[PDB]
């Protein structure tokens, strides 16, 4: 298993048609995931699985500019189980980042941080037993 938290450098940041995929299984009991794509210490696009939101399962997505929060994107569909494998795959597409969980699309996030070349890691964080990180340009 890779060390969490794990940087992922993104050489040159992200453009359509880059594909990210994360490969791990949830640990027991998790309580939170978290995937950031940062330009320096800015996070383009925060995608937080929270296990337990006032006993509601919610996907939170996010943007921070200058260390503020901006405002969440919510989603109640909520791939990820305690103890099981999955995959994530991020889509860099023209005005958004597509994600599919275990090749099921799940959602969309337009891009608040239009400099893309400039998101240049990725931090994947949690309560995670990480396998792999990698892209590649489809
Ligand atoms: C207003 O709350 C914040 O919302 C942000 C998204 O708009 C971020 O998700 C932020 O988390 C971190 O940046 C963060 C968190 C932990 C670490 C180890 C490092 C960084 C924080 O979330 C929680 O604290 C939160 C609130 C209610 C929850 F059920 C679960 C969470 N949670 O997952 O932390
Ligand atoms: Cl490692
Ligand atoms: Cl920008």
């Not at 275990?102 to 996030?109: C, E, M, P, S, V």
Request: some cysteine; glycine content about 6%.
């Amino acid at each position: 298993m890779l060390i969490v938290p794990y940087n992922l450098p993104l050489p040159g940041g992200v453009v359509p048609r880059m594909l990210i995929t994360i490969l791990g299984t949830v640990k027991p009991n998790a309580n939170r995931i978290a995937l950031d794509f940062q330009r320096g210490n800015d996070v383009a696009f925060h995608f937080n699985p929270r296990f337990n939101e006032n006993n509601r399962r919610v996907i939170v997505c996010n943007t921070k500019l200058d260390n503020n929060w901006g405002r969440e994107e919510r989603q109640s569909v909520f791939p990820f189980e305690s103890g099981k494998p999955f995959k994530i795959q991020v889509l860099v597409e023209p005005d958004h980042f597509k994600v599919a969980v275990n090749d099921a699309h799940l959602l969309q996030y337009n891009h608040r941080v239009k400099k893309l070349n400039e998101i240049s890691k990725l931090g994947i964080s949690g309560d995670i037993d990480l396998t792999s990180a990698s892209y590649t340009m489809i």
